[PDB]
Every structure is written in structure tokens, then in C-alpha cells.
Design a protein around this ligand. Sequence first.
Ligand SMILES: Cc1nc2ccc(C#Cc3nc(-c4ccccc4)cn3C)nn2c1CO
Ligand SMILES: [Mg+2]
Ligand SMILES: [Zn+2]
Length: 313
Amino acid sequence: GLMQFTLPVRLCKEIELFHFDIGPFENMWPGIFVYMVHRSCGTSCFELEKLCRFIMSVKKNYRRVPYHNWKHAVTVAHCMYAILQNNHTLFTDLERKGLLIACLCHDLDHRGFSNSYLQKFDHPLAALYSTSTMEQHHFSQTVSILQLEGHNIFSTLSSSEYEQVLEIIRKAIIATDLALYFGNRKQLEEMYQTGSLNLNNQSHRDRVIGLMMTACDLCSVTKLWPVTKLTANDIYAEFWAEGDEMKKLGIQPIPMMDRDKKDEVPQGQLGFYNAVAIPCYTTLTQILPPTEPLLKACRDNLSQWEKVIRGEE
Ligand SMILES: Cc1nc2ccc(C#Cc3nc(-c4ccccc4)cn3C)nn2c1CO
Ligand SMILES: [Mg+2]
Ligand SMILES: [Zn+2]
């Protein structure tokens, strides 16, 4: 009731910045997340006991894969927190409530394999969900955990507010399917530029929350260079394991997933920053000006990858 979560001073200050790294002490990640809910949403958004129990069941349903793990979930939530704290007044109480939960849950029970490997292996999830295979799984895992006893953090919401928040969470989690990102950012580009973009148009809000989700999900490219470079090793550890699995099915993987083509990583990251990251943070900064530090950090990391290619590191 009178119970604030507080962090040590360096964390209390640095958590407010976009480039914050949540650190290697796993047992602090739940308290970091509660801290962000309390400041973002309020000390009364959730019953603490239900929230704590929800966080620990979410944590237990992330697997120990190199990249798509519990650390990625809390990292993507921290980026969302920074966005919401720098754009206070643009977001409903339900959106604040739902989006941090969406980020924490967005990769639930990930196995370190793409939608594309599931379809080729013919995994049961690919017959249950023909598109956004893993992302429909993540949402379904979210609803499951929410329906466990004493886990309903949304218990105090009205019936219709409940249905609204679960609909925000669903669209937020679906939007993390990067295949959907390209069309969504193109449409937001055009709507912003012709001056049609309208935040009272719910279907416009949806697209903007979609773009934030892509931004939070890729936020590893906006960290300090050593964080960005070491996270890339985890990202490629998964891609190469998937490449190995492709070869086991008799399929030559794309070069991104072929550990034999390790040497071209620098050039591959460059393509990824130019094709995906830069456009994403450009359009996001256009629509939400206080998110510009994400664009600036992304550009500093692209420059670090250029430096790697030129032999300067
Ligand atoms: C947060 C985040 N999320 C992602 C997802 C993908 C990617 C990437 C990639 C890539 N690599 C190659 C490549 C590599 C070696 C040989 C040939 C091609 C091609 N592409 C597109 N990065 N990424 C980061 C930043 O690390
Ligand atoms: Mg995902
Ligand atoms: Zn993710």
C-alpha cells in the first residue's frame, strides 16, 4: 500500500534513458519491471501479489535460448517504458497497463526458431497458426498464464476494459512479427506525410503501437556499442542453430543462418540497419519526436558496423 520499489542510484537514474542495459543480475529483472510499472502506470495499476505471481510464471515460460529469453523480454519492456515516459500524455491508462505486459509476454515460450523453420519442419504450431505462427503462440501463452489462479492482474478492470486491454496486448504481440512491420511502417510513412495520420482513429493508434513494438523489439541496436555487439553474438547463435537445422532437413539456409558465412556478419548487420532498423526509428521519431535518442543510437551503431568493415575494429 505504502510500498515503493526503489533501485540503487545509478539504476534509478539510468533506467529513464533509452540506452539502459538491465545488467547480468537476473534476480533484479523482476524488481526492475515492477519499478517500471509503478512509475509508468501507478502503484495501484495491479495488486502486487498477483503481479509478482504473473511475472514469475512469465519468467518460467521463457526458455534458456541464447537470444529469445527472459532477458530479451525485460529489455523490450524497458524500451517501451522509456517511450511511454517520454510521451506521457499521448497514451490511455489501459494502453500503459497493456503495453508493458505485452512486451514482457511478446516472446513467451520461444524456441529460438523462426516462423519459417516451424513451417518447413511442419511443427504442429504451423498447422494451428498459418501466419505469425510464433506470435499467435506468444499471445495464447499470455492468456493461459493470465487464467492461472491468482494470476489475473486485470481482475479489477470492467468486463469491457478487460476485453480492450487483451485486444491491445494481442495486436501488440502480433505486430512483433517482422514480416508485418514493412507494410505497417510504409502506411504510417504515407499517412504522416500526406497529413492523414490521426491518433483518434483507433486503427491509426493500432499501427503506431505496432511500430513502437517493432522499435522495442529491435532496441538492442540502440544500446552502447559493446551491448549491441555482444547481443549480436546471441542473435547469430540462434540463427546458425536454425541454419544447422535447415541443413538437417535437406535445405540450404539463407546466408544470415549459415555459420559457414560468419565472415559476412558485419555487412549483414549493415543491410539489417539500412533495410529495417533505420527506417523503423526514422518513422517512429517522425511520429513521436521524443523517441529521437533511439534513432541517434541506431545511427551511432551503424557507424560502428561500418568501422568494423573498414578494419578499424
Ligand atoms: C536486434 C536485432 N534483430 C535482428 C534480426 C536480424 C539481424 C540480421 C542480419 C543479417 N545478417 C546477414 C548475413 C550475415 C552473415 C552472412 C551473410 C548475411 C544478413 N542479414 C539480414 N540483426 N538483428 C538485430 C541486430 O543484431
Ligand atoms: Mg518474436
Ligand atoms: Zn522479441
